[PDB]
Design a binder for this molecule. Sequence first.
Ligand SMILES: [Zn+2]
Ligand SMILES: [Zn+2]
Ligand SMILES: [Zn+2]
Lengths: 46, 263, 33, 134, 65
Amino acid sequence: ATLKYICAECSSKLSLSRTDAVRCKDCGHRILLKARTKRLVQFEAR
Amino acid sequence: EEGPQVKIREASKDNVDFILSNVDLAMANSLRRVMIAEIPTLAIDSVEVETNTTVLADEFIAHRLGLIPLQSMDIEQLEYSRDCFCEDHCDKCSVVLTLQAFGESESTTNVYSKDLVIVSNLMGRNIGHPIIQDKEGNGVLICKLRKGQELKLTCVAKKGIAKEHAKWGPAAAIEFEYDPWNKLKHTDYWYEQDSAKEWPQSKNCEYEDPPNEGDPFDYKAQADTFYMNVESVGSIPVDQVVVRGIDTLQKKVASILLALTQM
Amino acid sequence: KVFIGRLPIMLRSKNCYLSEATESDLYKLKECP
Amino acid sequence: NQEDSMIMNQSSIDRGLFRSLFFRSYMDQEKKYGMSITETFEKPQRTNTLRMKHGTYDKLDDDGLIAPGVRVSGEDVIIGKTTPISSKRDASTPLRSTENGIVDQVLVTTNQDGLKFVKVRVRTTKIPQIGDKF
Amino acid sequence: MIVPVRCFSCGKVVGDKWESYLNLLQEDELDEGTALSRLGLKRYCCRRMILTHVDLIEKFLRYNP
Ligand SMILES: [Zn+2]
Ligand SMILES: [Zn+2]
Ligand SMILES: [Zn+2]
């Protein structure tokens, strides 16, 4: 359910920790993103 | 009938063109301002974001959300959040909307103001419903989605005036004119050869009489009779944009008179 | 036969990948057309 | 509007006139000191050395990196990194003092030589204020 | 980059109009000027709003993830 990291290219959730290799599970490419906080953010409508 | 008279020329669901006979300029203008800023409306003023797989910035959308017009009919039977006693908001002071959107189709899936849906209880009062003047019944494109582009928001709309943010503006543009033939000499028309031939005559020239050359200037002449056109954005119906404009201004004057009594 | 260093490539030149990519290929390659 | 200045419609400014979007990318890398003496990305606290930043670390996750939702502001720590010696000296990168905003996109990759490479984007919206040139 | 909701100048909700504007030009093969007034855009403040907008959102959508 909850995701640590997301792959940038194939947008496949990778939910990894340190020393798990910065590569993706299928395509190689290390790109990897951090995927949004579950502590929901609010904005003023102005 | 009474003090200042009124003659409605043209009327619609969103435009009233009338003539304000037997008034002072100051009063006719004070009414203009009130309609612009001081009338209270309901507008989205909190956008809690859950998921935004969109090409668009959360705040871009958030700003955009407030600018959507919402039914503000029974607004006067809703407290300003700031005056209510709850921490933040409730049903007595706020209308809660919920937007869920996802691109199911291969083709671009669009998000419309119709797609917002009320989650708070309206207590049986005409409020919150987004204004849809659209022929196709969608009204206002919030944004567009691709494949798995998701958008989940919760919106809290509250009472407020346009003097705080133009989103609470119940009116579009108030057309205002007096003395079409410059008889009061409130302008000195810039010209090249003939001021009269260079400057176009307003539609209001038919509602007054041309001055006649051989007639000297009326230094005693004063401006009453103002040709106006109040346009509603949708929140409040045109008739009320005027009526509430008159009541709000009355209340402002009243507060002064009332404050003078405490002194 | 023998390696003698790496040469920087100009974007959209002969030896750059993008010289032959179509409008849709670029979007796919996350590059602005 | 006198002497090369101008008056602007605040009512128009609200409706979205001349609104900007400002982004800034903050970058960091785990430094290597020859004999596998490498720095690490982590949310640190006290520990023996005590060389650390004023700003709040409490916004960082356990990887020493803020999640892309968070609203950053003062001298708030954006990247938490640490250097040992012969142990919390600090190596953390705080948000530019003047600035404030929302964490936009955070990427974790690898530099050509196998080190942890991190770029953090911070999005904000710029409203046409008073000293604003046009 | 996505049609502005409301004209900056007078605040007439220009938001809904877009899709209908594009359809008047494409489908009803109308000239931009007539199409504009057909959507009810009378003042030039509202008129520039639609007439002068560049829908970059459609470009951004072309990017896959
Ligand atoms: Zn991948
Ligand atoms: Zn309340
Ligand atoms: Zn306008």
